């Protein structure tokens, strides 16, 4: 046994220097340096045909030391899968892995999440979203590690490739964006995910809203450097509405996949505006009138009906329409984020509330204290 | 018969999970608050002993008694893992020691720090200083891996007492292959 990693020692310059060492970790028997130096192997990049001879000798480790978590089994088996290329072959390994190893802290979220993301060759869509949803079922208690998760969504982003509910890939954006704090991975590989994550987040319109959590701060670092046209009309869905450039901005630059939904984005900026103007202003001036319906929306007549109505639906206004004089009213109001701006400006008409209302308060305690006493 | 209450603390740190003391730190920790336990069987039977997790935050589930049956119950799927904390595990024996109804027992504490911690030696000197007030003598056991040939934790240990005081004493554990019952053998002898 000690034969295998002489003849492996050397692979090149200051390979052996880091070996040296690994040969007096299991023979002093400490299996954390050893876990750590293997993983700094892990972390090495390889082939690897040097983690793919261990892994037989790495099996018999977990036999009798039973005690080291499957996190870093799972780590090791992930490089060397790569030198397998096959995931048929290694499923039946890493399934093996799963009932050999029981501890308190779960195996089989971490395994379930390697089960699937060998799974992308099956290739997906059959039973990919079964062992997906196993996943969570366990990971819900207790969800203490929180990095695993991140592996949750790798074959749960993977799943959405089937198109696949664009609106949900969003929704599944925030079991990313909400599994890990800190990036910790090239920033310019998420300013092409902020890339296809406005687009297809805006494409599927599952997702009513879809601008409430738009300005948190990690994803707006990714849309600095993302290209800039991009965000201007995301501002316009976030905020806007309309910016008619913008919202043509963005089949400008991306043509594929925006065909079918372009009509249908038009769509939202003239559902979007009917919250806004009621927002905006303090008004009421809540009935509003067709013709700036037809000049903000630029809409026709004949189209008023279906536009307001199907808003009542959504749910971001119930108003009911008057159409004697075809004047569109409005109830109730869909408040979205806020601007520097909007805080200034309720300060003006929020605390106007409470200057006006305490003057006048003071003369009902002032005149009538007396008939009380 | 010496009287005191010794508050062992168990090491739940990530680095307590592999096989250096043999077969397993778990065990082997296990095995050394065997060791403590049944000593104090055979010093003193007022003598009560309770346990404390260091590493996370710090949870008492076991009242202070001197019956050692909880105490080996715990010792099982403790599952050690977390951050390792030393100095909030310092006056954590000496408040569970305030609420002690004898007022005759000393106050002595013995913790277990298996993992490297992050410590200046400012920190250090006043917690020491801080329990020459309050008169508690502490007797640390390294295990697990440190700094080689730790220096914190010694100077923990030389400035926690003085003159004589009989005493702290810290004893390295070499970074090899022993069962626990063997590194047990000089700290055991001579606290």
Same mark, same amino acid.
């Given at each position: ?6 003849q ?8 052996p220097?880091? @070996?040296h ?5 299991? &023979?002093?028997?400490?299996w954390?340096?050893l876990t ?6 892990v ?5 690897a045909?040097?983690?793919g001879?261990?892994?037989l000798?790495? %099996? ?8 080291? %978590?499957?996190?870093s089994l799972v ?10 290329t096959d ?8 399934e ?5 190893v ?28 079964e ?13 203490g590690?929180?990095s695993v ?10 799943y959405?490739?089937?198109?696949g509910?664009?609106a ?10 909400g599994?890990?704090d800190?990036?910790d991975l ?9 890339? &296809?994550?406005?687009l297809?987040?805006?494409l ?6 879809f ?5 948190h ?5 990714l849309? %600095?450097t993302?290209?800039?046209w ?15 450039f913008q919202?043509?901005?963005?089949? @400008?630059?991306?043509?594929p996949?925006?065909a079918a ?11 979007l505006?009917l919250?806004?103007?009621?927002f ?5 001036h ?14 026709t ?8 109505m ?6 971001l206004?119930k108003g009911?329409?008057?159409?004697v004089?075809?004047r569109?009213?409005?109830?109730w109001?869909?408040?979205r984020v ?12 929020l605390?106007? @509330?409470?200057?006006?209302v305490?003057s ?5 305690e ?8 | 018969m010496v009287?005191?209450s010794?508050?062992?603390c168990?090491d739940?740190?990530?680095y ?21 336990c ?8 007022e003598?009560?002993?309770?346990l404390?997790?260091?590493?996370n935050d710090?949870?008492?589930?076991t ?9 080996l119950?715990?010792?099982?799927t403790?599952?050690p893992?977390?951050k390792?904390?030393?100095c909030? !595990?310092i006056?954590v ?20 720090v !298996? ?5 200046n030696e400012?920190?250090?000197?006043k917690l ?7 008169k ?5 056991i390294?295990?697990?891996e440190?700094?080689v ?14 003159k004589?005081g ?5 004893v390295?554990v070499?970074? !090899? ?15």
């Amino acid at each position: 046994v000690p034969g295998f990693l002489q003849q492996s020692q050397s692979s090149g310059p200051g390979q052996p220097a880091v @070996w040296h060492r690994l040969e007096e970790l299991y &023979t002093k028997k400490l299996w954390h340096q050893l876990t750590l130096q293997v993983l700094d192997f892990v972390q090495d990049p390889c082939f690897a045909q040097g983690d793919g001879l261990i892994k037989l000798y790495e %099996n018999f480790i977990s036999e009798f030391e039973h005690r080291v %978590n499957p996190l870093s089994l799972v780590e090791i088996i992930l490089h060397v899968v790569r030198q397998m290329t096959d995931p048929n072959v290694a499923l039946t390994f890493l399934e093996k892995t799963r009932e050999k190893v029981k501890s308190s802290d779960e195996a089989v979220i971490l395994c379930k999440t390697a089960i699937g993301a060998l799974k992308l060759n099956i290739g997906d869509l059959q039973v990919t979203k079964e062992t997906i949803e196993d996943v969570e079922e366990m990971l819900n208690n207790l969800p203490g590690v929180t990095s695993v998760h991140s592996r949750f969504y790798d074959l749960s982003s993977k799943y959405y490739q089937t198109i696949g509910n664009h609106a949900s890939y969003y929704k599944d954006a925030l079991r990313f964006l909400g599994c890990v704090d800190i990036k910790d991975l090239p920033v310019s590989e998420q300013q092409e995910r902020a890339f &296809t994550l406005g687009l297809a987040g805006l494409l599927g319109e599952g997702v009513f809203n879809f601008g409430e959590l738009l300005m948190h701060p990690v994803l707006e670092s990714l849309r %600095n450097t993302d290209r800039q046209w991009l965000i201007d009309t995301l501002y316009a869905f976030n905020s806007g509405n309309v910016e008619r450039f913008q919202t043509l901005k963005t089949a @400008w630059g991306q043509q594929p996949d925006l065909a079918a939904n372009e009509a249908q984005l038009l769509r939202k900026i003239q559902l979007l505006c009917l919250m806004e103007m009621t927002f905006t202003r303090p008004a009421n001036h809540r009935q509003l009138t067709f013709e700036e319906i037809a000049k903000s929306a630029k809409i026709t007549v004949n189209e008023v009906e279906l536009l307001v109505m199907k808003a009542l639906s959504v749910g971001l206004v119930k108003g009911s329409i008057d159409e004697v004089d075809k004047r569109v009213h409005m109830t109730w109001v869909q408040p979205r984020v806020l601007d520097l701006q909007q805080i200034k400006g309720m300060k003006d008409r929020l605390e106007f @509330w409470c200057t006006d209302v305490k003057s006048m308060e003071m003369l009902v305690e002032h005149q009538a204290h007396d008939i009380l006493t | 018969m010496v009287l005191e209450s010794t508050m062992v603390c168990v090491d739940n740190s990530e680095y307590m999970r592999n096989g250096d003391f043999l077969p397993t730190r778990l065990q082997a920790q296990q095995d050394a608050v065997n060791i403590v336990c049944h000593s104090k069987t055979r010093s003193n039977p007022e003598n009560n002993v309770g346990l404390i997790t260091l590493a996370n935050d710090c949870e008492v589930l076991t009242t202070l008694t001197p019956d050692t049956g909880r105490i080996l119950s715990k010792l099982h799927t403790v599952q050690p893992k977390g951050k390792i904390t030393f100095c909030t !595990g310092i006056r954590v024996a000496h408040l569970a020691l305030k609420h002690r109804q004898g007022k005759n027992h000393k106050m002595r504490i013995i913790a277990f720090v !298996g993992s490297p911690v992050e410590d200046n030696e400012k920190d250090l000197v006043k917690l020491a200083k801080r329990l020459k007030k309050e008169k508690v003598n502490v007797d640390i056991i390294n295990f697990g891996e440190e700094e080689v040939n730790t220096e914190k934790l010694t100077a923990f240990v030389n400035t926690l007492n003085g003159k004589d005081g009989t005493g702290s004493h810290l004893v390295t554990v070499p970074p !090899g292959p022993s069962l626990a019952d063997a590194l047990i053998s000089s700290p055991i002898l001579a606290g």
